[PDB]
Amino acid sequence: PKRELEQGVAFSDLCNFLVTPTVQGWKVYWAGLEFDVNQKGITLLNRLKMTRNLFPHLFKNQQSEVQTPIWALRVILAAGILDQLMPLSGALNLIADWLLTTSTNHFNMRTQRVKDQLSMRMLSLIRSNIINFINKLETLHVVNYKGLLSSVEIGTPSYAIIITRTNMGYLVEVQEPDKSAMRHPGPVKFSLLHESTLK
């Protein structure tokens, strides 16, 4: 049955965040997209917590917590979905949430409605959103003294995402919707994804 095949492939590709260890780090395969995530930049972030004074809310703040590079990738995927989002966006939003607020490799479709939504079209729309987003990110300039764009922000009721281009990769942060971390020393989660990962 055509619907059956279609939904079989969409379910498989959207509900399984596939991670495979490699020599340099990790291969991630999700939604038919492939990423090489390496462990570079990892140690540097621990060590920091000039740049240190630029992002005091991350480095000079006992409420900031460094995450894994895979977490950073997942934040980038969710952001990619949400950025155009701002049809059934219910399913999209669920997916983005799963990606960003959890570390599980499988997406439990709770409702049957959600399951019904999983289709070639949904796969297609998600892939296109994420690719568009990645292209946008690649247009960011490194942090600079002229007025050239270096950050994008994706704000939602539940959380605020901020992604910044620096000489060491994309700095990926999630703060509370209000931006309590920016006083004040509100909580914030963050990491670094090397440039190579998005190419």
Author numbering: 13 to 61, 71 to 107, 114 to 209, 212 to 228
Structure paper excerpt:
VP24, one of only eight proteins encoded by ebolaviruses, functions in virus replication and assembly, and is thought to contribute to immune suppression by binding to a certain class of molecules called karyopherins to prevent them from transporting a transcription factor termed STAT1.
We determined the structure of SUDV11–233 at 2.1 Å resolution by multiwavelength anomalous diffraction (MAD) using selenomethionine-incorporated protein expressed recombinantly in E. coli. Another crystal lattice interaction observed in both RESTV and SUDV structures involves packing of the hydrophobic N-terminal regions of VP24 into the Face 3 pocket of a neighboring molecule.
